[PDB]
Amino acid sequence: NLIQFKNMIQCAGTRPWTAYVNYGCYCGKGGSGTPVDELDRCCYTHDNCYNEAEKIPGCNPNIKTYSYTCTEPNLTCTDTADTCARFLCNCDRTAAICFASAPYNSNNVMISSSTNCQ
Template structure:
């Protein structure tokens, strides 16, 4: 009985620890997007590339291309035996009063590279905000994204 309780506690600890890790970087990206005055929900399931994974090779618009470039940025810095895992790291950044974003980790570290990928994506979102089309969000898109994005 005591062994079962210990196993449940250990499993719970491991589950919450590992379940929380991938969200670290996503939470930081969310805060960067919010710093620019947008909702991070605007980019979940947008077009072919925004959100978790992607649907294919096409790009709907400039906002979707920002997401594609973000995915490619993560791909570039990922890999290797001791490689960078940008979705798992936490990094340091500062939101400037003019709306800018400053990544503050040491140059050439995984943390800094992940921050730079996120910063560039958020700056891209801001640059193309006027072309943002809410009809490209999941749930509002009138069509099959799996077909449209191939």
């Protein structure tokens, strides 16, 4: 669930989802080339993760609503029976934590056309 993902972001970190709407080569719609930094790699993994999520029967990363708890700055995925929800919550929680731990080089903000994003 895209809504849950952005709420899962401010739980683990300080930067809201808007800080990431367009950063590096992979944060934001689609993605190409090689990640530029640690954060961009966070996004790179998240995408490959959603791509994986689609290989799960009746599993759509945008709409699927999972279960999780936030004891700031702690995230916990409670699902264990529902694979999609489990796997999907996993993708988001990983990304959210990754984002908060990674640095934010405002320089790599909006370089989608630079030679770096092959």
